[PDB]
């Protein structure tokens, strides 16, 4: 039950080569640089972004490139990806793009400098889709009272993969309806095992292919050689994005940047440390039960090392959080493979229940395992709200709610500042 | 300890643009096309191959592709490719290369067709490098009563990433050491962690580059669309190669291909099903001790289900042998997490002990654990030969033990033909 094509939300701007499906993104490790995107359909147009400060007005002019691609019989529009650099923080800034024919505006607010006890509010949406249930989760992460600076995706997008030969409209019309958001704040993009679109039968068989044409992120600047995993710092957080479907076996290039990249975390400068993935390590559902566990034997124990605060995941199309529980001490044969609560391990929350195509995951094993704190089959997203450096608050709302009420409320206290427990 | 390269294995043959380092392999599903491989200096030559048969002395000629590369301040070869199909079963084939040139002949015999009762006795070598051991292993294979037809080697080639800069010129020396071995009869490929070869510090970011472009597999044949993972039929053995240091994860290439191959193995037409992978998915060695529970979690359940027959390994520079068990039981919170043995489920067997670069791994996990039957820090090679669909024999034989001293054997009953306990 996908929203169809004459849907208001995908109408498509007006103007001879409109640019349309715009999306920003952090573009650096710190973030002082944003990669501004988009794609026009009648002409390969201009790759160039107009943009300034609302104070010092300004106005400089950034070049970037141009790409198309083909998937089957599909052709791509004109996609542009620019990188503005050495911003200012905590500004706001006005960009217009599309400057040789028709000309759209949009703006956004660098974050703060990199700090202790900078305070910041994520977003946490995952599996989005665009079918009903998508727009209204949308809507309410807009109208929510603590207002988002920034959202963290966590895989599935948009579920084009589903149409006759993946459909790549639908990855065009998912640019279109998400515009409203990704062009005004960044959205930190996680691939999910939707963006795979691997099809020996019509020939695509490079892996994420859609994808990465449409979407692309600042790796390099983290010293990562692939897009599907690449960290960034961002207010007082640390964000790590990891790639569940790409190789991490030991020696593999995300399994040896991984590695070097905990070590590199300071949280004297950034104090809350963040994980992404798209399938959860910890999941009490039946649907996709167990599929986290080849990434859990191996990043687990890094996981608990270094102390992360939070790892979220989506995948599983509703709503779980655990208590903060390791299995680290299994040796095959000495009988230690049940969890435990392990108070320097991180806390595990599935929020992939944004939408995708209206379908929601009721079945949950039973009865409910001690590591799972709370769990719920309801539509939603979350937000992750960073106070101090030593308090974070999150909560969950559900599409049947109002905007304003947090069906799920918990108080983070931080695992390198404020080691106590913070079990609910 | 490895071999210098004044050592009269790494001699190059003498004559201009003479063939070196020339190595086959099998070029089809069936048996029925070689892949021939070499490599010239002096200058590009011809990548033209021309063979006959010892009966119909009709000489004919099959032309191939060359290429080269780079890698740091090293600049290859002139690398040759040549495919030759329609060739008739259980036949001797001659064949000559740098025809334009210094020609160089060789000779080989192409399996009978594949049948139930079709005998076959494969090898097996793990580990190789080019250490003075490696030179005995190999010399052991060669002089060997029961001669082996075809080699499955299991991973880890020449270990150049040893040397700085990965020196290339190691996988050269290699390339001529084994050469009067695999220029005579196929060797079955499978990609060890050392063949990964990520170095970013030398702006080598390519998985795999040096090895991919030197060795070539007919993974095309089975539907694959990658050479890391595929399979083949050899004689009554159906032979599937998995590649531990790819993406694996639900959805991804290898796991599709995976689950469909499976599907495809017929045990009425090959009725021995054979699983090659550089990691070990059972070790008691202390020596990357569960590396392998990633692929397990992953794969384990189905190499049941299909009742695999064998399953051969290497990365732990030693010998083991497994009992047929199963850890498939487990569910997070119900406690089943010890091995079990299981008639149905595969004999696991790692002979990753050809000889590297000198080192064995001696430490292992004491006390033995139940699952392991047979291991031994000692260099060596094994030999699987098949005689019936119900009957194959399996021996290890030492490089302290004489060529026809079997320090460790089994008889292995078909999981699929004769299902009875074969214990030892
Ligand atoms: C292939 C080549 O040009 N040889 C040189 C080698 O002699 C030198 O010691 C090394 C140092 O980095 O660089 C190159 O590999
Ligand atoms: C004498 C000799 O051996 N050189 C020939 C050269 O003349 C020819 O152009 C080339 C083409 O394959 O083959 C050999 O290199
Ligand atoms: C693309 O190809 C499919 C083949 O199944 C066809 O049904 C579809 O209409 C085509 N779409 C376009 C507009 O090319
Ligand atoms: C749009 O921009 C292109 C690229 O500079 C230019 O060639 C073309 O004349 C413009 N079209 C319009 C809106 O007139
Ligand atoms: C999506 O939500 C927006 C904001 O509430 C609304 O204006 C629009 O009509 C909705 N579109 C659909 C198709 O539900
Ligand atoms: C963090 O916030 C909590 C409540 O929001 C407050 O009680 C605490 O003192 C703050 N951290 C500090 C010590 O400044
Ligand atoms: C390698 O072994 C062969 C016998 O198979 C022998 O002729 C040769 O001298 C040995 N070379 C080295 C360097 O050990
Ligand atoms: C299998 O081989 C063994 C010995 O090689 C023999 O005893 C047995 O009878 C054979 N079975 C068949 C199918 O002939
Ligand atoms: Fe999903
Ligand atoms: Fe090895
Ligand atoms: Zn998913
Ligand atoms: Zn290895």
């Not at 050495?86 to 700090?115: A, C, D, H, M």
């Not at 409209?169 to 279109?176: A, C, E, I, K, Y």
Request: charge should be positive; hydrophobic fraction near 35%; proline fraction near 6%.
């Amino acid at each position: 039950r996908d929203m169809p094509l004459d849907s208001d939300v995908f109408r498509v701007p007006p103007g001879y080569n409109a640019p349309q499906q715009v999306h920003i993104t952090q573009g650096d490790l710190v973030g002082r640089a944003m990669i501004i995107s988009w794609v026009t359909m009648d002409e390969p147009g201009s790759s160039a972004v107009r943009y300034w400060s609302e104070k010092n007005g300004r106005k400089r002019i950034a070049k970037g490139k141009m790409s198309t691609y083909r998937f089957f019989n599909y052709s791509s529009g004109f996609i542009h990806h620019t990188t503005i650099r050495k911003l200012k923080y905590n500004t706001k800034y006005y960009y217009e793009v599309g400057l040789r024919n028709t000309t759209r505006r949009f703006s956004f607010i660098t974050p703060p400098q990199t700090g202790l006890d900078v305070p910041y509010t994520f977003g946490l949406i995952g599996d989005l889709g665009q079918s009903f249930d998508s727009n209204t989760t949308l809507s309410h992460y807009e109208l929510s009272p603590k207002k988002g600076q920034t959202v963290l995706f966590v895989g599935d997008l948009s579920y084009a993969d589903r149409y006759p030969n993946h459909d790549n409209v639908r990855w065009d019309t998912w640019g279109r309806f998400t515009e409203r958001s990704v062009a005004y704040q960044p959205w930190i993009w996680t691939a999910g095992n939707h963006e795979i679109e691997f099809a020996p039968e019509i020939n695509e068989t490079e892996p994420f292919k859609p994808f990465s044409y449409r979407y692309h992120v600042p790796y390099e600047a983290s010293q990562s050689t692939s897009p599907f995993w690449y960290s960034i710092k961002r207010a007082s957080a640390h964000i790590i994005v990891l790639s569940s479907y790409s190789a991490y076996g030991r020696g593999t290039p995300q399994y040896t940047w991984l590695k070097k990249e905990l070590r590199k975390v300071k949280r004297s400068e950034t104090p809350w440390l963040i994980v992404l993935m798209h399938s959860p390590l910890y999941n009490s559902y039946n649907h996709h039960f167990m599929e986290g566990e080849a990434m859990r034997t191996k990043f687990e124990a890094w996981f608990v090392k270094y102390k992360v605060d939070v790892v979220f995941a989506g995948h599983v199309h509703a709503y779980e959080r655990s208590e903060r529980v390791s299995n680290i001490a299994y040796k095959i044969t000495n009988g230690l493979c049940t969890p435990v609560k392990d108070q320097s391990a991180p806390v595990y929350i599935t929020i992939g229940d944004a939408g995708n195509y209206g379908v929601i995951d009721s079945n949950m094993i039973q009865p409910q395992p001690e590591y799972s704190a709370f769990r719920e089959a309801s539509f939603g997203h979350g937000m992750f709200d960073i106070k101090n450096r030593t308090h974070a608050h999150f909560s969950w709302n559900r599409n049947q709610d109002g905007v304003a009420v947090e069906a799920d409320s918990v108080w983070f206290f931080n695992r390198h500042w404020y080691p106590v427990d913070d079990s609910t």
